[PDB]
């Protein structure tokens, strides 16, 4: 019932009871652990709304008050009638902040309560979505002093009137398959880069071409939009020691903004809720730049460094990996663009876990995602036991629209 | 029920059916995942069924399931059990059992080598001196002058739980750790408690930074006894860096033979409480964990200073930088001295091939992602991108309480 998690580097032991309020399943069973798998009605709705309202009023110290009972009734009535409901702005903001608070795969949750929520529920068209998204981008970028934000479009109704941002992130680079069979630009976005063209986009066919937004409002077909360049902060990548580094022709965008997730609050589903915070260095330097299936630039960098690439045991890949990541962080800091290294971010998360354990009785955390893709054990989270479980409100994965849209 | 795991780097999908044979519990529930939790006498009543499941697996493995030899064996054991409340494995069953416990060890990335395990049968051992002798032969055989050979030595199984054989050391070879009165620690901090028990038992500590600990051996539930492994039998490797001539001056060295000796081997219900085994090191075990964990030798800073790295702010990634060099040094020193070792890139690539083979020939491969992925450069190794299924199959290697916490001293 009362589970304990131990940190093997500091012997600190925390007790978790928050998991007892868990509602969704994990993918695992007592016979099998799937911890490393990437993707494990009015009658249905009211109980959800109730659970949410109870936690909402409880958080404001008005659990079971008249206001609570009242709102509970009002929502109850609304559901019975309309077969759904609308959150009060206060609930919208609380729900979003908590969905972030509950994202077990996010190492940056110590920032959870500072989220700026943009209510775009009155939106009706793709141009309207583009407008809201541009405002989000400018607000969050804040000339390099990034501020976390989320813009929430209209909730789901009949499932045939869904708003969806087709991009996986608001800002990403295009990827095109060349005759060579090789891939130019970002390989992860090869397909999307195609669906944009299958729509009319005029690809400059470059290595770092900011993709166009493909916005879907109310179910209708999506529409393309070029984000005003001055709104897309980019960072030229240079090494604080290797002048030749810049010759690599590397740069990345400063704003990470997940746009393909679904937000669940009190049973209500928000299929278009792009959100953004700021990068942890390794996301770019380790994953985007060195993944074998991404920009895969390890060899090139190792060559320039003139390292013995004959035997894996010389650890040239490891050597290069480090330099590359030193560069990413150096560049961002130099341009005064917010960014955080894995040491600092993970140190933050441990503090955050401790705060959540004392103030909330726990903190759902997914070790597989929390530990950085490089230098795992020299970061504190590696030695930290974590309990993973699903709490709502939450952020969930959802099918790429191009695999569900009825044109 | 079928289950698939996908490798997101190659899109190779695999199907697991072997998990269906999984009987033991994982620690997780439908509502919670304990995937990152370090540590999540039998009755006749429960024994024979465990015996049967095992003998069935064994006879199927040799293509004799349902034969007369199979049936007679099941009858022979059934009888022995009701007759003696236990039973003895045939040599062939023991060898098979030991190999499969390794094969089934979900946290082991070196399982591609599982079928080559050399098994030493020490079930006739009765005293600690006998244990010492067996352990010495295992170490010399396994070490093989630097060309390491995997091996396991199996002492008598548990009976009533009051006559257990145990190796109190956590590994056959490990360095002493000494807590100084000023609060600092000399040697390996991980071994401070065990070292104190050794000194108390009478060991004369040389008190250096790399003193090979003595063996503290327990036979038939008796009080443990001390023994010094012959120095000529302990292969050690001085660590130096191929480019940094000052590295050698850090005075670092490590032993070549990694030999877990505190685990419990379960086979067909029988419990082997003393079953030391060895293979060879993956570089990062020493370079990352032994040398760089904050709670171990913790040398990042000193190596950082010597390299003249900007240590003012973490974002310089000075720790990351020093880490790589230290690991380059460990691999380099071992290769130079021709002492077997494997780097994490090579070891992980091998585990992926092994894993694919296991799915195709066995229907699955239980694997613990948290442990399989190396403690450094995680995503640039293929296992990072590989989905895995973790489940417990027997035969198996299990954790057991440290003996100093359960032993009834006879004095
Ligand atoms: C302010 C700084 C923030 C930092 C440093 C941070 C860092 C991270 C990192 C490293 C990951 C894993 C990324 C990957 O490997 O692809 C992640 C995942 C995630 N974060 Fe955060 N995050 C921040 C803000 C946010 C915000 C504002 C939200 C939403 C309100 C959020 C929600 C999540 C979710 C749901 C995931 C997992 C997404 C998935 O499964 O792909 N994060 N975060
Ligand atoms: C042939 C060389 C081998 C290599 C390269 C290898 C490598 C490893 C590594 C890197 C780990 C994790 C160690 C740690 O992080 O502390 C491990 C764990 C494990 N290995 Fe292997 N291994 C090998 C041979 C063996 C042998 C011979 C056995 C048994 C017969 C075995 C049984 C296990 C077990 C049971 C674990 C888990 C230990 C625990 O949970 O504490 N390994 N191995
Ligand atoms: N810092 C953040 N990172 C999440 C988005 C970027 C990620 N590298 C892409 N990604 O999840 C790739 C798909 N597996 N979030 N945020 O600050 O809002
Ligand atoms: N290569 C092997 N490694 C396992 C034993 C060494 C480990 N670093 C010590 N250890 O797990 C200390 C406590 N967590 N095995 N083997 O070759 O048989
Ligand atoms: C197969 C495995 O689940 C997959 O590679 C995971 C591992 N850990 C991760 N951790 C983070 N933060 N992000 C990822 O994309 C992944 N990928
Ligand atoms: C808390 C966490 O589970 C623990 O530190 C684990 C993580 N992964 C590991 N992986 C290996 N190979 N060895 C370890 O000791 C650990 N420690
Ligand atoms: Zn699990």
CSV table of N, CA and C in Angstrom, one decimal, chain B residues 210-328:
chain,number,residue,atom,x,y,z
B,210,UNK,N,44.1,-0.2,-2.5
B,210,UNK,CA,43.7,-1.3,-3.4
B,210,UNK,C,44.2,-2.6,-2.7
B,211,UNK,N,43.7,-2.9,-1.6
B,211,UNK,CA,44.0,-4.2,-0.9
B,211,UNK,C,42.9,-5.2,-1.3
B,212,UNK,N,43.4,-6.3,-1.9
B,212,UNK,CA,42.5,-7.4,-2.2
B,212,UNK,C,41.9,-8.0,-0.9
B,213,UNK,N,40.6,-8.0,-0.8
B,213,UNK,CA,40.0,-8.6,0.4
B,213,UNK,C,40.2,-10.1,0.6
B,214,UNK,N,40.1,-10.6,1.8
B,214,UNK,CA,40.3,-12.0,1.9
B,214,UNK,C,38.9,-12.7,1.8
B,215,UNK,N,38.9,-14.0,1.5
B,215,UNK,CA,37.7,-14.7,1.4
B,215,UNK,C,37.1,-15.0,2.7
B,216,UNK,N,35.8,-14.8,2.9
B,216,UNK,CA,35.2,-15.1,4.2
B,216,UNK,C,34.2,-16.2,3.8
B,217,UNK,N,34.6,-17.5,4.1
B,217,UNK,CA,33.8,-18.6,3.7
B,217,UNK,C,33.1,-19.4,4.8
B,218,UNK,N,31.8,-19.7,4.5
B,218,UNK,CA,30.9,-20.4,5.4
B,218,UNK,C,30.4,-21.8,4.8
B,219,UNK,N,30.7,-22.9,5.5
B,219,UNK,CA,30.3,-24.2,5.0
B,219,UNK,C,29.3,-24.8,6.0
B,220,UNK,N,28.3,-25.5,5.5
B,220,UNK,CA,27.4,-26.2,6.3
B,220,UNK,C,26.8,-25.4,7.5
B,221,UNK,N,26.6,-24.1,7.3
B,221,UNK,CA,26.0,-23.3,8.3
B,221,UNK,C,26.9,-23.0,9.5
B,222,UNK,N,28.2,-23.3,9.4
B,222,UNK,CA,29.1,-23.0,10.4
B,222,UNK,C,29.6,-21.5,10.4
B,223,UNK,N,30.3,-21.1,11.4
B,223,UNK,CA,30.8,-19.7,11.4
B,223,UNK,C,31.8,-19.6,10.2
B,224,UNK,N,31.8,-18.4,9.6
B,224,UNK,CA,32.7,-18.2,8.4
B,224,UNK,C,34.2,-18.1,8.8
B,225,UNK,N,35.0,-18.5,7.9
B,225,UNK,CA,36.5,-18.5,8.1
B,225,UNK,C,37.2,-17.7,7.1
B,226,UNK,N,38.3,-17.1,7.5
B,226,UNK,CA,39.1,-16.2,6.6
B,226,UNK,C,40.2,-17.0,5.8
B,227,UNK,N,40.5,-16.6,4.6
B,227,UNK,CA,41.5,-17.1,3.7
B,227,UNK,C,41.9,-16.1,2.7
B,228,UNK,N,43.2,-16.0,2.5
B,228,UNK,CA,43.8,-15.0,1.6
B,228,UNK,C,44.0,-15.8,0.3
B,229,UNK,N,43.4,-15.2,-0.8
B,229,UNK,CA,43.6,-15.8,-2.1
B,229,UNK,C,45.1,-15.6,-2.5
B,230,UNK,N,45.7,-16.6,-3.0
B,230,UNK,CA,47.1,-16.5,-3.4
B,230,UNK,C,47.3,-15.3,-4.3
B,231,UNK,N,48.2,-14.3,-4.0
B,231,UNK,CA,48.4,-13.2,-4.9
B,231,UNK,C,48.7,-13.5,-6.3
B,232,UNK,N,49.5,-14.5,-6.6
B,232,UNK,CA,49.8,-14.9,-8.0
B,232,UNK,C,48.5,-15.3,-8.8
B,233,UNK,N,47.5,-15.6,-8.0
B,233,UNK,CA,46.2,-16.0,-8.7
B,233,UNK,C,45.3,-14.8,-9.0
B,234,UNK,N,45.6,-13.6,-8.4
B,234,UNK,CA,44.8,-12.4,-8.7
B,234,UNK,C,45.4,-11.5,-9.8
B,235,UNK,N,44.8,-11.6,-11.0
B,235,UNK,CA,45.3,-10.8,-12.1
B,235,UNK,C,44.8,-9.4,-11.9
B,236,UNK,N,45.7,-8.4,-12.0
B,236,UNK,CA,45.4,-7.0,-11.8
B,236,UNK,C,46.0,-6.2,-13.0
B,237,UNK,N,45.4,-5.1,-13.3
B,237,UNK,CA,45.8,-4.3,-14.4
B,237,UNK,C,46.0,-2.8,-14.0
B,238,UNK,N,47.2,-2.3,-14.1
B,238,UNK,CA,47.5,-0.9,-13.8
B,238,UNK,C,46.9,-0.1,-14.9
B,239,UNK,N,46.2,1.0,-14.5
B,239,UNK,CA,45.5,1.8,-15.4
B,239,UNK,C,46.3,3.0,-15.9
B,240,UNK,N,46.5,3.2,-17.2
B,240,UNK,CA,47.2,4.3,-17.8
B,240,UNK,C,46.4,4.7,-19.0
B,241,UNK,N,46.6,6.0,-19.5
B,241,UNK,CA,45.9,6.5,-20.6
B,241,UNK,C,46.9,6.5,-21.8
B,242,UNK,N,46.4,6.2,-23.0
B,242,UNK,CA,47.2,6.2,-24.2
B,242,UNK,C,47.8,7.5,-24.7
B,243,UNK,N,47.2,8.6,-24.3
B,243,UNK,CA,47.7,9.9,-24.6
B,243,UNK,C,48.1,10.8,-23.4
B,244,UNK,N,47.4,10.6,-22.3
B,244,UNK,CA,47.8,11.3,-21.0
B,244,UNK,C,48.8,10.5,-20.2
B,245,UNK,N,50.0,10.9,-20.3
B,245,UNK,CA,51.1,10.3,-19.5
B,245,UNK,C,50.9,10.5,-18.0
B,246,UNK,N,50.2,11.4,-17.6
B,246,UNK,CA,50.0,11.6,-16.1
B,246,UNK,C,48.9,10.7,-15.6
B,247,UNK,N,48.1,10.1,-16.4
B,247,UNK,CA,47.1,9.2,-15.9
B,247,UNK,C,47.6,8.1,-15.0
B,248,UNK,N,48.7,7.4,-15.5
B,248,UNK,CA,49.3,6.4,-14.7
B,248,UNK,C,49.7,6.8,-13.3
B,249,UNK,N,50.0,8.1,-13.2
B,249,UNK,CA,50.4,8.7,-11.9
B,249,UNK,C,49.2,8.8,-10.9
B,250,UNK,N,48.0,8.5,-11.3
B,250,UNK,CA,46.9,8.6,-10.4
B,250,UNK,C,46.9,7.3,-9.5
B,251,UNK,N,47.8,6.4,-9.9
B,251,UNK,CA,48.0,5.2,-9.1
B,251,UNK,C,46.8,4.2,-9.1
B,252,UNK,N,46.1,4.2,-10.2
B,252,UNK,CA,44.9,3.4,-10.3
B,252,UNK,C,45.1,2.0,-10.9
B,253,UNK,N,44.4,1.0,-10.4
B,253,UNK,CA,44.5,-0.3,-10.9
B,253,UNK,C,43.2,-1.0,-10.6
B,254,UNK,N,42.9,-2.1,-11.3
B,254,UNK,CA,41.7,-2.9,-11.1
B,254,UNK,C,42.0,-4.4,-11.3
B,255,UNK,N,41.2,-5.2,-10.7
B,255,UNK,CA,41.3,-6.6,-10.9
B,255,UNK,C,40.7,-7.0,-12.2
B,256,UNK,N,41.2,-8.1,-12.9
B,256,UNK,CA,40.7,-8.5,-14.1
B,256,UNK,C,39.5,-9.4,-14.1
B,257,UNK,N,39.3,-10.1,-13.0
B,257,UNK,CA,38.2,-11.1,-12.9
B,257,UNK,C,36.9,-10.7,-12.1
B,258,UNK,N,35.8,-10.4,-12.8
B,258,UNK,CA,34.6,-10.0,-12.0
B,258,UNK,C,33.9,-11.3,-11.6
B,259,UNK,N,33.7,-11.5,-10.4
B,259,UNK,CA,33.0,-12.7,-9.9
B,259,UNK,C,32.0,-12.6,-8.8
B,260,UNK,N,30.7,-12.4,-9.2
B,260,UNK,CA,29.6,-12.3,-8.3
B,260,UNK,C,29.6,-13.6,-7.5
B,261,UNK,N,29.5,-13.4,-6.1
B,261,UNK,CA,29.5,-14.6,-5.2
B,261,UNK,C,28.4,-14.5,-4.1
B,262,UNK,N,27.5,-13.6,-4.2
B,262,UNK,CA,26.5,-13.4,-3.2
B,262,UNK,C,25.1,-13.8,-3.7
B,263,UNK,N,25.0,-14.3,-4.9
B,263,UNK,CA,23.6,-14.6,-5.4
B,263,UNK,C,23.2,-16.0,-5.1
B,264,UNK,N,21.9,-16.3,-5.3
B,264,UNK,CA,21.3,-17.6,-5.0
B,264,UNK,C,20.9,-18.2,-6.3
B,265,UNK,N,21.3,-19.4,-6.6
B,265,UNK,CA,20.9,-20.2,-7.8
B,265,UNK,C,19.8,-21.1,-7.5
B,266,UNK,N,18.6,-20.9,-8.1
B,266,UNK,CA,17.5,-21.8,-7.9
B,266,UNK,C,17.4,-22.7,-9.2
B,267,UNK,N,17.3,-24.0,-9.0
B,267,UNK,CA,17.1,-25.0,-10.0
B,267,UNK,C,16.1,-26.0,-9.6
B,268,UNK,N,15.0,-26.1,-10.4
B,268,UNK,CA,14.0,-27.1,-10.1
B,268,UNK,C,13.6,-27.1,-8.6
B,269,UNK,N,13.5,-25.9,-8.0
B,269,UNK,CA,13.2,-25.9,-6.6
B,269,UNK,C,14.3,-25.9,-5.6
B,270,UNK,N,15.5,-26.5,-6.0
B,270,UNK,CA,16.6,-26.5,-5.1
B,270,UNK,C,17.3,-25.2,-5.0
B,271,UNK,N,17.8,-24.9,-3.8
B,271,UNK,CA,18.4,-23.6,-3.6
B,271,UNK,C,19.9,-23.7,-3.3
B,272,UNK,N,20.7,-23.1,-4.3
B,272,UNK,CA,22.2,-23.1,-4.1
B,272,UNK,C,22.6,-21.7,-3.7
B,273,UNK,N,22.8,-21.6,-2.4
B,273,UNK,CA,23.2,-20.3,-1.7
B,273,UNK,C,24.6,-19.9,-1.9
B,274,UNK,N,25.5,-20.8,-2.4
B,274,UNK,CA,26.9,-20.4,-2.6
B,274,UNK,C,27.1,-20.9,-4.0
B,275,UNK,N,27.2,-20.0,-5.0
B,275,UNK,CA,27.3,-20.3,-6.4
B,275,UNK,C,28.1,-19.3,-7.1
B,276,UNK,N,29.3,-18.9,-6.7
B,276,UNK,CA,30.1,-17.9,-7.4
B,276,UNK,C,30.3,-18.1,-8.8
B,277,UNK,N,30.1,-17.1,-9.7
B,277,UNK,CA,30.3,-17.2,-11.1
B,277,UNK,C,31.1,-16.0,-11.6
B,278,UNK,N,31.7,-16.2,-12.8
B,278,UNK,CA,32.5,-15.1,-13.4
B,278,UNK,C,32.5,-15.2,-14.9
B,279,UNK,N,32.7,-14.1,-15.5
B,279,UNK,CA,32.8,-13.9,-17.0
B,279,UNK,C,34.0,-13.0,-17.2
B,280,UNK,N,33.7,-11.8,-17.7
B,280,UNK,CA,34.7,-10.8,-17.9
B,280,UNK,C,34.0,-9.4,-18.0
B,281,UNK,N,34.8,-8.4,-17.7
B,281,UNK,CA,34.3,-7.1,-17.6
B,281,UNK,C,33.9,-6.3,-18.9
B,282,UNK,N,32.8,-5.5,-18.8
B,282,UNK,CA,32.5,-4.6,-19.8
B,282,UNK,C,33.1,-3.3,-19.2
B,283,UNK,N,33.9,-2.6,-20.0
B,283,UNK,CA,34.6,-1.4,-19.5
B,283,UNK,C,33.9,-0.4,-18.6
B,284,UNK,N,32.7,0.0,-18.9
B,284,UNK,CA,32.0,0.9,-18.1
B,284,UNK,C,31.7,0.5,-16.7
B,285,UNK,N,31.8,-0.8,-16.4
B,285,UNK,CA,31.5,-1.3,-15.0
B,285,UNK,C,32.6,-0.7,-14.1
B,286,UNK,N,33.8,-0.7,-14.6
B,286,UNK,CA,35.0,-0.1,-13.9
B,286,UNK,C,35.1,1.4,-14.1
B,287,UNK,N,35.2,1.8,-15.4
B,287,UNK,CA,35.4,3.2,-15.7
B,287,UNK,C,34.3,4.2,-15.3
B,288,UNK,N,33.1,3.8,-15.4
B,288,UNK,CA,32.0,4.6,-15.1
B,288,UNK,C,31.5,4.4,-13.6
B,289,UNK,N,31.1,3.2,-13.3
B,289,UNK,CA,30.6,2.9,-12.0
B,289,UNK,C,31.7,2.8,-10.8
B,290,UNK,N,32.6,1.9,-11.0
B,290,UNK,CA,33.6,1.7,-9.9
B,290,UNK,C,34.5,3.0,-9.7
B,291,UNK,N,34.9,3.6,-10.8
B,291,UNK,CA,35.7,4.8,-10.6
B,291,UNK,C,35.0,6.2,-10.5
B,292,UNK,N,33.8,6.3,-11.1
B,292,UNK,CA,33.2,7.6,-11.1
B,292,UNK,C,31.9,7.8,-10.3
B,293,UNK,N,31.3,6.7,-9.8
B,293,UNK,CA,30.1,6.9,-8.9
B,293,UNK,C,30.6,7.8,-7.8
B,294,UNK,N,29.7,8.7,-7.3
B,294,UNK,CA,30.1,9.6,-6.2
B,294,UNK,C,30.4,8.8,-5.0
B,295,UNK,N,29.7,7.7,-4.8
B,295,UNK,CA,29.8,6.8,-3.6
B,295,UNK,C,30.9,5.7,-3.8
B,296,UNK,N,31.7,5.7,-4.9
B,296,UNK,CA,32.7,4.7,-5.1
B,296,UNK,C,34.1,5.5,-5.0
B,297,UNK,N,35.0,5.2,-6.0
B,297,UNK,CA,36.3,5.9,-5.9
B,297,UNK,C,36.2,7.4,-6.2
B,298,UNK,N,35.1,7.7,-6.9
B,298,UNK,CA,34.8,9.1,-7.2
B,298,UNK,C,36.1,10.0,-7.6
B,299,UNK,N,36.6,9.6,-8.8
B,299,UNK,CA,37.8,10.3,-9.3
B,299,UNK,C,37.6,11.4,-10.4
B,300,UNK,N,36.3,11.6,-10.7
B,300,UNK,CA,36.0,12.6,-11.8
B,300,UNK,C,36.8,13.9,-11.6
B,301,UNK,N,36.8,14.5,-10.4
B,301,UNK,CA,37.4,15.8,-10.1
B,301,UNK,C,38.9,15.7,-10.4
B,302,UNK,N,39.6,14.8,-9.7
B,302,UNK,CA,41.1,14.7,-9.9
B,302,UNK,C,41.5,14.5,-11.4
B,303,UNK,N,40.7,13.7,-12.1
B,303,UNK,CA,41.0,13.5,-13.5
B,303,UNK,C,40.6,14.8,-14.2
B,304,UNK,N,39.6,15.5,-13.7
B,304,UNK,CA,39.2,16.8,-14.2
B,304,UNK,C,40.2,17.9,-14.0
B,305,UNK,N,40.8,17.9,-12.9
B,305,UNK,CA,41.9,18.9,-12.6
B,305,UNK,C,43.1,18.7,-13.5
B,306,UNK,N,43.6,17.5,-13.5
B,306,UNK,CA,44.7,17.1,-14.3
B,306,UNK,C,44.6,17.4,-15.8
B,307,UNK,N,43.3,17.3,-16.3
B,307,UNK,CA,43.0,17.7,-17.7
B,307,UNK,C,42.8,19.2,-17.9
B,308,UNK,N,42.9,19.9,-16.8
B,308,UNK,CA,42.7,21.3,-16.8
B,308,UNK,C,41.4,21.7,-17.5
B,309,UNK,N,40.3,21.2,-17.0
B,309,UNK,CA,39.0,21.4,-17.5
B,309,UNK,C,38.3,22.5,-16.8
B,310,UNK,N,37.5,23.3,-17.5
B,310,UNK,CA,36.7,24.4,-16.9
B,310,UNK,C,35.7,23.7,-16.0
B,311,UNK,N,36.0,23.7,-14.7
B,311,UNK,CA,35.1,23.1,-13.7
B,311,UNK,C,34.2,24.1,-13.0
B,312,UNK,N,34.2,25.3,-13.4
B,312,UNK,CA,33.4,26.4,-12.8
B,312,UNK,C,31.9,26.1,-12.9
B,313,UNK,N,31.4,25.7,-14.1
B,313,UNK,CA,30.0,25.4,-14.3
B,313,UNK,C,29.7,24.0,-15.0
B,314,UNK,N,28.8,23.3,-14.4
B,314,UNK,CA,28.5,21.9,-15.0
B,314,UNK,C,28.3,21.9,-16.5
B,315,UNK,N,27.7,23.0,-17.0
B,315,UNK,CA,27.4,23.1,-18.5
B,315,UNK,C,28.7,23.0,-19.4
B,316,UNK,N,29.8,22.9,-18.7
B,316,UNK,CA,31.1,22.8,-19.5
B,316,UNK,C,31.2,21.3,-19.9
B,317,UNK,N,30.5,20.5,-19.1
B,317,UNK,CA,30.5,19.1,-19.3
B,317,UNK,C,31.8,18.5,-19.0
B,318,UNK,N,32.5,19.0,-18.0
B,318,UNK,CA,33.8,18.6,-17.6
B,318,UNK,C,33.7,17.1,-17.1
B,319,UNK,N,32.6,16.8,-16.4
B,319,UNK,CA,32.5,15.5,-15.8
B,319,UNK,C,32.3,14.5,-17.0
B,320,UNK,N,31.5,14.9,-18.0
B,320,UNK,CA,31.3,14.0,-19.1
B,320,UNK,C,32.6,13.8,-19.8
B,321,UNK,N,33.4,14.9,-20.0
B,321,UNK,CA,34.7,14.8,-20.7
B,321,UNK,C,35.6,13.9,-20.0
B,322,UNK,N,35.8,14.1,-18.7
B,322,UNK,CA,36.7,13.2,-17.9
B,322,UNK,C,36.3,11.8,-17.9
B,323,UNK,N,35.0,11.6,-17.9
B,323,UNK,CA,34.4,10.2,-17.9
B,323,UNK,C,34.9,9.5,-19.1
B,324,UNK,N,34.7,10.0,-20.3
B,324,UNK,CA,35.2,9.3,-21.5
B,324,UNK,C,36.6,8.9,-21.4
B,325,UNK,N,37.5,9.9,-21.0
B,325,UNK,CA,38.9,9.6,-20.9
B,325,UNK,C,39.2,8.4,-20.0
B,326,UNK,N,38.6,8.4,-18.8
B,326,UNK,CA,38.8,7.4,-17.8
B,326,UNK,C,38.4,6.0,-18.4
B,327,UNK,N,37.4,6.0,-19.2
B,327,UNK,CA,36.9,4.8,-19.8
B,327,UNK,C,37.8,4.4,-21.0
B,328,UNK,N,38.4,5.4,-21.6
B,328,UNK,CA,39.4,5.1,-22.7
B,328,UNK,C,40.6,4.4,-22.1
